[PDB]
Design a protein around this ligand. Structure first.
Ligand SMILES: [Zn+2]
Lengths: 89, 102, 356, 179
RNA sequence: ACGAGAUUCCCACUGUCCCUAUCUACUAUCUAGCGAAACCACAGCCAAGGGAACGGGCUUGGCAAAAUCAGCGGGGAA
RNA sequence: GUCCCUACUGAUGAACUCGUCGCAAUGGUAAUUCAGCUUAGUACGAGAGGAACCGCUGAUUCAGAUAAUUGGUUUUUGCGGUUGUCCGACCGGGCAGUGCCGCGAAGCUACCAUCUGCUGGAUAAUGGCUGAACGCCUCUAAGUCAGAAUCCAUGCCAG
RNA sequence: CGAAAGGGUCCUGUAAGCAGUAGAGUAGCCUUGUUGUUACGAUCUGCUGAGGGUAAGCCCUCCUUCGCCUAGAUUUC
């Protein structure tokens, strides 16, 4: 109840900062890089990083068509970015 | 011809088509569409070497058997002179020497 | 099952007989009734529907059509029948001079080893002042017969078939006086009759053919199970059937070089699918595009005849407008209508550069 | 009445071909065949499979920048019907197609630019290491040619002519056993 | 608490079914050679009639055309 | 406490010289129900409500076909991946009564797909015309009109 | 007519081999390396929508190549 239209999006930073990355991947449709109304500097940084390649942006656009290798690649890229950004682990 | 007319329908297409024709003449001008015996004999010899390798492999595959059969040793079997005379001839050896051994 | 088709035996003949020509009155103009063609296969079309009162009105519909290869038939004879208290009786038949080798092949079982002399003495009847004999038979038909039929045979050298033995049949001449139709039949001798003259577009016809055989089959697939009225095992298939009310969607000319083109798509292509009709070949003659499915296997002789009665539906007398005709390969999941369209999509290949 | 493109491979999807999948988010996926449909249900990556346009575009096998391929796009603002406009559009399309293929031909040749240099370099290595497998005439042929040269009165040129003619012109297995 | 104990309920799966379709091997089929047995008064189409609710041979109708191959299960007192 | 003949379903067949094109005695017989649009918010009705003929379009059941398309099936052992063991390694392969997995043409199939199902005469109940019986009267007695998904045929199947 | 072959159409999915320090990793040489070197090196990339199969119940053949042919046996007014 309440999740009509069966569609949900977040920002990429939320996927980076979350404690449960598996929950976001399994329950959302799109990881967006759209600059927030205010303007997120982390989005600007994460967009311009060389780790996020064309394949990474392809998977984030459509989460419901991904497979085993694609999901693992997203988790690996999350860990690499968190190391750059100084997150705990 | 496998295309959608509605996809290409666009006003001012004459200007776009005219611009494309200019690009074609310029590209035909500077040389974007221009097409540019020792090597032939080397390749022919390389094919001959590869063909000989296949024939040698075919000869080896001919005798191999699928699973480890006991075989007659070469020293045990006896061979005709015609086969030895022929094979030596293909290798470029004069016959004059052989003919008196057996 | 149905007891109206009860003697589920193999058809006595491979060709199939009309068994009923439409009732004749002298008021209509002189015309032919039936024709022969060879089943080529099936293809998909898109039709701009114009059915007032239907859900798909003013909309595009995808339909399945069957293609029948129809080389022109050659009229080589004439037959006359008289009315008797015991039914119709053949009084006399008048053959034409100069019959072809194919139609003579029908008269022989071993044509290769035979001294081909069928109708050799009959030819002398025309050319040796025995034309009185030919005219006497023609006058006999005029003054004694009530139904006159035409013997026409196919031309299978044009068909991509290994068979060389043509097919004969009698086609009734309807609509006129007996004298008028006799002069009609004599004038048609030695002449090819094309399919666009017998039938035409957006008219509804009946097709007669022998169904596909299945051999000895049990009750499960023969009579459809979940004495004469009890389901048994026996022959299934190869049964003579007469299917009625099939609408002609197009008649192709073969020489047009744009048979499959419509006023909507401007692609110069013929009806033959990419790679050819599977197990048939290429249709290089006139063809009749019939809606739906029709009894018979591919390359089987097909008998087309007219409707016995004036139609009572709006499916007849309604115009058929075509948008696009499929030509992609039937040998697989085809996606290209023309050889050019495949090369444009995939670019150039390794063999293309090596050859060039 | 439109020609659609496959979601998986991008092949021309014509009417009554393939299958369409409707997702609860409100998106429709069009497939040209069961091969593409079954790969989609198994969650394979079209960008990784080598028989798809997604791989070919992303791997540099196809031209993605050009003036020709920008002419065609999906139009969301209808243009009022005009007979002259449609007729010249068809002529424009025909001109556009032959320019595209005759630009695509250069693209393929540029991709395979250095291929003969590698082939001859490998061929030079093979001959240098396997010189004993080259044609070598025959011992009887050398003798018979030597007498013919002696009778004529250029043995090296005569041998070369014989060597070439036999190379211009297969061995069986076993043979007859006398009964 | 325990039980290859029974029953009910819940989740999951299934050609059990809607409703069937396809595929493989051995048979079934044909040939060469070899080669029985059960059983057998004589036979073998149907209808009505043949008092003893009994017909296979009689009556009087329907009919009725050589010789064969495969399938089946309809018939042969208390 | 007792594998044969026939029937039926199919397939051949000697005699009539072989073949081609036909006729049609006889036998069987096939179509069914519902809905929607228009008529019409009309006739009818105080109101609430609320039809039908002509015309048009679908669907249920049944029947006969067909493979363009979609799905299913795979010994195409067609291509690819992979487990165990082996041919000394590579390449190429064997065996695991088709090792397992993915796709898979062709063929076969599916109201899981698609197509098609047709018109004359005579009647039953009943409603009538002219008109005796019976100086009224009466559809009946002589004569005669219409009329059911009925009957008989055509279309259809066999010959 | 038959057998091959070429082309087309479909199926699969990128062959064997060679090459690029792209390459994680495993080790020697000399002495410190701020850019030291030499070998092996799973994997990746290019040659390569390549390679393989294609009628057995797919399609075509301009001389694409090779071959076969007017039989032999019985019966019939
Ligand atoms: Zn696709």
């Amino acid at each position: 109840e309440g999740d009509y239209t069966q569609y949900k999006e977040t920002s990429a930073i939320e996927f980076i900062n979350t404690t449960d990355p598996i929950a976001i991947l399994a329950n959302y449709n799109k990881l967006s890089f759209e600059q927030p109304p205010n303007g997120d500097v982390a989005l600007a940084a994460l967009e311009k990083l060389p780790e996020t390649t064309k394949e990474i942006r392809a998977c984030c656009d459509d989460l419901k068509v991904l497979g085993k290798k694609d999901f693992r690649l997203l988790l690996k890229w999350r860990l690499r970015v968190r190391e750059i950004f100084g997150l705990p682990s | 011809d496998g295309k959608n007319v509605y996809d290409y329908i666009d006003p001012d297409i004459d200007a776009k088509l005219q611009a494309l024709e200019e690009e074609e003449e310029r590209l035909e001008k500077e040389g974007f569409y221009d097409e540019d015996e020792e090597e032939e004999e080397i390749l022919q010899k390389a094919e001959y070497i590869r063909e000989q390798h296949a024939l040698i492999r075919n000869e080896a595959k001919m005798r191999k058997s699928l699973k480890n059969r006991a075989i007659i040793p070469r020293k045990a079997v006896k061979k005709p002179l015609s086969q030895l005379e022929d094979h030596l001839d293909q290798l470029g050896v004069d016959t004059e020497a052989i003919g008196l051994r057996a | 099952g149905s007891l109206a088709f009860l003697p589920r035996k193999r058809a006595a003949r491979h060709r199939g007989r009309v068994k009923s020509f439409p009732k004749d009155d002298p008021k209509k103009p002189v015309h032919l009734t039936a024709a022969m063609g060879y089943k080529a296969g099936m293809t998909t079309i898109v039709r701009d529907l114009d059915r007032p009162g239907a859900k798909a009105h003013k909309k595009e519909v995808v339909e399945a059509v069957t293609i029948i290869d129809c080389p022109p038939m050659v009229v080589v004879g004439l037959v006359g029948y008289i009315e008797t208290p015991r039914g119709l009786r053949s009084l006399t038949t008048v053959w034409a001079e100069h019959l072809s080798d194919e139609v003579k092949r029908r008269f022989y079982k071993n044509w290769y080893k035979s001294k081909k002399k069928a109708f050799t003495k009959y030819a002398k009847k025309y050319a040796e002042n025995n034309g009185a004999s030919i005219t006497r038979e023609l006058e006999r038909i005029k003054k004694y017969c009530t139904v006159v039929r035409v013997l026409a045979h196919t031309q299978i050298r044009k068909t991509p078939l290994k068979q060389k033995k043509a097919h004969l049949m009698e086609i009734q001449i309807n609509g006129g006086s007996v004298a008028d139709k006799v002069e009609f039949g004599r004038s048609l001798f030695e002449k090819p009759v094309t399919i666009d003259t017998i039938f035409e577009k957006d008219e509804m016809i009946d097709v007669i053919a022998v169904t596909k055989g299945h051999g000895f089959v049990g009750v499960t697939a023969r009579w459809g199970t979940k004495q004469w009225t009890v389901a048994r095992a026996g022959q299934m298939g190869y049964h003579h059937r007469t299917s009625v009310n099939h609408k002609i969607y197009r008649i192709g000319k073969g020489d047009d070089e744009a048979n499959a083109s419509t006023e909507t798509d401007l692609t110069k292509k013929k009806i033959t699918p990419m790679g050819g009709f599977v197990r048939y070949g290429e249709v290089n003659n006139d063809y009749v595009m019939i809606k739906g499915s029709v009894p018979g296997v591919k390359k089987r002789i097909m008998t087309l005849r007219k409707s016995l009665f004036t139609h009572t539906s709006r499916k007849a007398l309604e115009k058929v407008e075509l948008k696009w005709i499929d030509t992609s390969s039937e040998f697989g999941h085809g996606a290209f209508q023309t050889a050019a369209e495949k090369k444009q999509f995939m670019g150039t290949l390794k063999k293309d550069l090596q050859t060039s | 009445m439109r020609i659609e493109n496959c979601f998986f491979c991008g092949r021309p999807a014509w009417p009554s071909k393939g299958i369409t999948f409707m997702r609860n988010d409100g998106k429709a996926f069009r497939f040209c065949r069961s091969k593409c449909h079954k790969n989609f249900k198994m969650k394979r990556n079209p960008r990784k499979l080598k028989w798809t346009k997604a791989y070919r575009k992303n791997a540099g096998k196809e031209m993605v920048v050009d003036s020709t391929l920008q002419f065609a796009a999906r139009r969301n603002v209808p243009v009022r019907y005009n007979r002259e406009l449609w007729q010249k559009t068809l002529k424009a399309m025909e001109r556009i197609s032959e320019i595209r293929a005759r630009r695509e031909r250069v693209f393929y040749k540029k991709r395979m630019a250095g291929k003969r240099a590698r082939e001859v370099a490998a061929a030079r290595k093979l001959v240098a290491e396997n010189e004993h497998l080259l044609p070598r005439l025959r011992g009887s042929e050398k003798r018979r040619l030597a007498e013919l040269a002696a009778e004529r009165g250029d043995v090296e040129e005569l041998e070369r002519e014989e060597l070439a003619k036999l190379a211009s012109k297969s061995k069986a297995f076993g043979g007859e056993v006398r009964r």
